[PDB]
Amino acid sequence: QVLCTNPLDIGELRSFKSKQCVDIVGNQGSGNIATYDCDGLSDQQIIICGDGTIRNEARNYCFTPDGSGNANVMSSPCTLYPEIPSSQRWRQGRRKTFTDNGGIEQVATEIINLASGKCLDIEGSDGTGDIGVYDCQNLDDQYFYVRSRGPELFYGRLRNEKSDLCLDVEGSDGKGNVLMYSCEDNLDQWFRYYENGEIVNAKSGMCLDVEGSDGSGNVGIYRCDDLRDQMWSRPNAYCNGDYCSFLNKESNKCLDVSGDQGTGDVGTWQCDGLPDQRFKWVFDDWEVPTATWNMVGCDQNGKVSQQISNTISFSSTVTAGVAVEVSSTIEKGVIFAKATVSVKVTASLSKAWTNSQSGTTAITYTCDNYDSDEEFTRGCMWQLAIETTEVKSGDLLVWNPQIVKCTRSNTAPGCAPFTKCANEDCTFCTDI
Ligand SMILES: CO[C@H]1O[C@H](CO)[C@H](O)[C@H](O)[C@H]1O
Ligand SMILES: CO[C@H]1O[C@H](CO)[C@H](O)[C@H](O)[C@H]1O
Ligand SMILES: CO[C@H]1O[C@H](CO)[C@H](O)[C@H](O)[C@H]1O
Ligand SMILES: CO[C@H]1O[C@H](CO)[C@H](O)[C@H](O)[C@H]1O
Ligand SMILES: CO[C@H]1O[C@H](CO)[C@H](O)[C@H](O)[C@H]1O
Ligand SMILES: [Ca+2]
Ligand SMILES: [Ca+2]
Ligand SMILES: [Ca+2]
Ligand SMILES: [Ca+2]
Numbered sequence: 202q203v204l205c206t207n208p209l210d211i212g213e214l215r216s217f218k219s220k221q222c223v224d225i226v227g228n229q230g231s232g233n234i235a236t237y238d239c240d241g242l243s244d245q246q247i248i249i250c251g252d253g254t255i256r257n258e259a260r261n262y263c264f265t266p267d268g269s270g271n272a273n274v275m276s277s278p279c280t281l282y283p284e285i286p287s288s289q290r291w292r293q294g295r296r297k298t299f300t301d302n303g304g305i306e307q308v309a310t311e312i313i314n315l316a317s318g319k320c321l322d323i324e325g326s327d328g329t330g331d332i333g334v335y336d337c338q339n340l341d342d343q344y345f346y347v348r349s350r351g352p353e354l355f356y357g358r359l360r361n362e363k364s365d366l367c368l369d370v371e372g373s374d375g376k377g378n379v380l381m382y383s384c385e386d387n388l389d390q391w392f393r394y395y396e397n398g399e400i401v402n403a404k405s406g407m408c409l410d411v412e413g414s415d416g417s418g419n420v421g422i423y424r425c426d427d428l429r430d431q432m433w434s435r436p437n438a439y440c441n442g443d444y445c446s447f448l449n450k451e452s453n454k455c456l457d458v459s460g461d462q463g464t465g466d467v468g469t470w471q472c473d474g475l476p477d478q479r480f481k482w483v484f485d486d487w488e489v490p491t492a493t494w495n496m497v498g499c500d501q502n503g504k505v506s507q508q509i510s511n512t513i514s515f516s517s518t519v520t521a522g523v524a525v526e527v528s529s530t531i532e533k534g535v536i537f538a539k540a541t542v543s544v545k546v547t548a549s550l551s552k553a554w555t556n557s558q559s560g561t562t563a564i565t566y567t568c569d570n571y572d573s574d575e576e577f578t579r580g581c582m583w584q585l586a587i588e589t590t591e592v593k594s595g596d597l598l599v600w601n602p603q604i605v606k607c608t609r610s611n612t613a614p615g616c617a618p619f620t621k622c623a624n625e626d627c628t629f630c631t632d633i
């Protein structure tokens with residue numbers, strides 16, 4: 202009945218060993234956990250909760266050992282009352298850092314069960330197969346990273362310099378062949394471009410891909426596979442103002458339109474410096490969002506319990522189009538107490554925003570512990586507010602997600618959302 206209100210990170214949880222995703226069977230967010238190909242579905246968006254639980258965006262279920270000893274791990278109902286049991290709580294152990302093939306620094310850690318002290322584990326040694334708990338053995342297949350794409354660099358539709366047409370996916374489900382088409386106010390034409398080189402379709406969550414593996418061929422949308430032929434550079438040398446070429450990292454060929462009129466099928470071709478090989482990002486300006494905490498309630502002589510709703514205020518309906526613009530804006534950068542936040546904060550916040558769009562879900566939430574972990578005996582409950590302005594109109598948007606910090610202080614938490622209060626009064630932070 203109660204979602205995770207103090208999340209620390211949201212994204213794919215990956216094996217340090219194989220780089221495969223930690224996967225719940227099917228797409229509903231319940232059932233056995235094992236490694237699988239990363240597939241872009243919401244059940245693979247794992248939520249690292251500040252309360253120790255590990256949940257997912259498909260359903261409010263918890264990573265749960267099916268018994269004592271070296272047991273199987275599955276996604277099962279979370280036990281919240283009288284308290285979350287230590288068997289459904291996990292801590293990060295030892296850490297391993299590495300740079301992935303997209304050039305992004307990742308941080309892997311052991312994931313340790315609080316009841317048993319056993320490690321989240323993949324069968325055998327190769328980092329593929331069934332997932333459960335086992336004695337910690339220091340091996341790579343007991344280390345897991347929440348995947349970072351690096352910074353979101355650019356976003357929007359992609360308009361060809363020659364034709365004024367937009368980069369398009371056939372149909373409207375964001376799947377299949379990419380070609381030029383009339384610019385349309387549909388998600389299947391909206392793309393988000395990351396430091397890891399991925400260009401991601403907003404409708405399908407899938408990647409701008411070249412057929413086969415050599416980076417020379419027809420371009421379409423396919424399962425993000427982390428391969429070099431789905432990585433793209435946007436080098437300054439090829440930019441003319443805001444119109445730039447996109448070079449495939451596998452073949453060094455340019456994102457290209459058939460012929461020279463900017464009107465046909467899209468593939469990769471030898472770069473030629475012609476206008477049909479340049480594209481501009483088309484998007485509305487929104488102000489860098491700001492994060493603040495609002496007091497929901499205080500109790501100096503015990504716990505505080507409140508109704509916590511997801512609310513959004515704006516000048517008009519937050520359309521699917523407005524929602525992807527805001528998501529993209531958030532991921533690009535957010536300010537907290539006049540400082541930027543880390544890549545995982547903006548990535549997680551934008552994922553929370555997206556998941557917030559179809560309800561939600563007013564909840565009765567109680568401050569049982571301080572965000573810093575100690576038992577809550579007095580203080581205040583604080584709810585996040587995210588604010589931004591659409592520059593063209595001057596219209597302010599305010600989002601109050603179901604994201605809460607419990608602290609001992611009447612002073613607002615000193616920590617960004619998706620970071621952990623280090624002390625009861627929350628004056629400094631960890632897990633930033
Ligand atoms: C056929 O795929 C389905 O089940 C597998 C496990 O077999 C994965 O969980 C995948 O995400 C889900 O869509
Ligand atoms: C028999 O040991 C093997 O399987 C267990 C789980 O059964 C663990 O994955 C362990 O690391 C692996 O060496
Ligand atoms: C009937 O048009 C449909 O397919 C074309 C491609 O032929 C475009 O992708 C358009 O967005 C879609 O509605
Ligand atoms: C059959 O798979 C191959 O082609 C598809 C396009 O059909 C993708 O590019 C994939 O990466 C590649 O391995
Ligand atoms: C035969 O060349 C023509 O088509 C190819 C793709 O087939 C490229 O678009 C190239 O720029 C164009 O001159
Ligand atoms: Ca799945
Ligand atoms: Ca193992
Ligand atoms: Ca289309
Ligand atoms: Ca491919």
Ligand SMILES: [Ca+2]
Nearest residue numbers: 458459460461
């Ligand atoms: Ca061409």
Ligand SMILES: [Mg+2]
Nearest residue numbers: 234273274332
């Ligand atoms: Mg399992």
Ligand SMILES: [Mg+2]
Nearest residue numbers: 379419420467
């Ligand atoms: Mg194509």
